[PDB]
Amino acid sequence: MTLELQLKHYITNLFNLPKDEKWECESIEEIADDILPDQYVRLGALSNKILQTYTYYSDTLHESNIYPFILYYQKQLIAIGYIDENHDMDFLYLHNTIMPLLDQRYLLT
């Protein structure tokens, strides 16, 4: 099962959204400092790195103001999670290009 499908199942199950609703994905680049919490960004790790960012959206996701995302860095996985209405970011995974910082991918099942 693709990562993004695992993420979709975790999300639609967590928030009780229509499991079979088509999701669309917006893919853009931006600097990790402008996205991640300060505590996740240090010089020599994620700081100044340009992440390739994938942000999922649908009608009911928009209704939710829920924004699931998967971040990469040059094809290294960097983060999986979701942002909510109030910009509380939740993470199921975080790697700072040096080591894994947070790996709760077992949560997806």
């Binding site: 893919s27 853009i28 680049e29 931006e30 390739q52 942000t55 995302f69 942002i83 910009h87």
Partner: protein
């Protein structure tokens, strides 16, 4: 390189000749176009060739009042049509654009929004919506980011800004603020974080569209009507 040939190929409106033609003298422009044309033969390239330069056709250099910088074009078929941010008419706005439009509506509760994302009306009204990368491989974002558009496009914008003072620039996100640094004594430079929802600051709170209008008024320029619907 030949302006007549170049213009025909891209269906470029001739009013942009004086800002763009000087580019063709630069050997890097010849490599860019050759590399672009090589991508076009080896892969599916977006947006369609005739659209790469659609921004030239919506308004003339003299009409341009506001400059909004994008990075590169939507890479899924149907989406890009040669403007930054904007999508084709029956495409639901993706997260970034939908947030742009939310800020518009916040700035202007009265603004007519169709719930659609196509920004042609702004373009016609002199809102230059310009990506620093003009093309992309279908399916792969930022796949053309290093073939040399940024230089070419940065030249055109430099020549545009040089013609007369008092453009508004809206520079959203780190790429745009780094790529384009206009003289804030000469132009109105408006900065913000990227409109993507992934941004730490919600873009919904961006007041650029109002602040730009207040600026233009101080300069005898009529404000933009930021309505997406006619």
């Amino acid at each position: 390189l030949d302006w007549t040939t170049f213009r025909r190929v891209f269906l470029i409106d001739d009013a942009w000749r004086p800002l763009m033609e000087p580019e063709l003298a630069n050997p890097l422009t010849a490599h860019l176009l050759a590399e672009y044309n090589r991508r076009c033969q080896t892969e599916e390239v977006l947006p369609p060739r005739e659209d790469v330069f659609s921004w030239t056709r919506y308004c003339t250099p003299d009409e341009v009042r506001v400059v909004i910088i994008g990075q590169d074009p939507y890479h899924h078929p149907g989406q890009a049509h040669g403007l930054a941010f904007s999508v084709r008419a029956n495409v639901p706005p993706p997260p970034s654009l939908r947030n742009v439009l939310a800020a518009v509506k916040n700035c202007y509760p009265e603004a007519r929004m169709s719930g659609h994302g196509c920004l042609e009306k702004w373009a016609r009204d002199g809102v230059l919506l310009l990506n620093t990368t003009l093309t992309v491989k279908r399916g792969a974002a930022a796949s053309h980011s290093r073939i040399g558009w940024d230089r070419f496009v940065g030249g055109v914008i430099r020549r545009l800004a040089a013609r007369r003072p008092g453009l508004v620039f809206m520079l959203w996100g780190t790429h745009a603020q780094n790529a384009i640094r206009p003289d804030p004594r000469v132009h109105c430079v408006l900065k913000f974080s990227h409109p993507s929802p992934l941004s730490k600051v919600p873009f919904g709170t961006c007041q650029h569209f109002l602040v730009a209008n207040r600026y233009l008024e101080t300069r005898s320029i009529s404000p933009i009507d930021w309505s997406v619907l006619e």
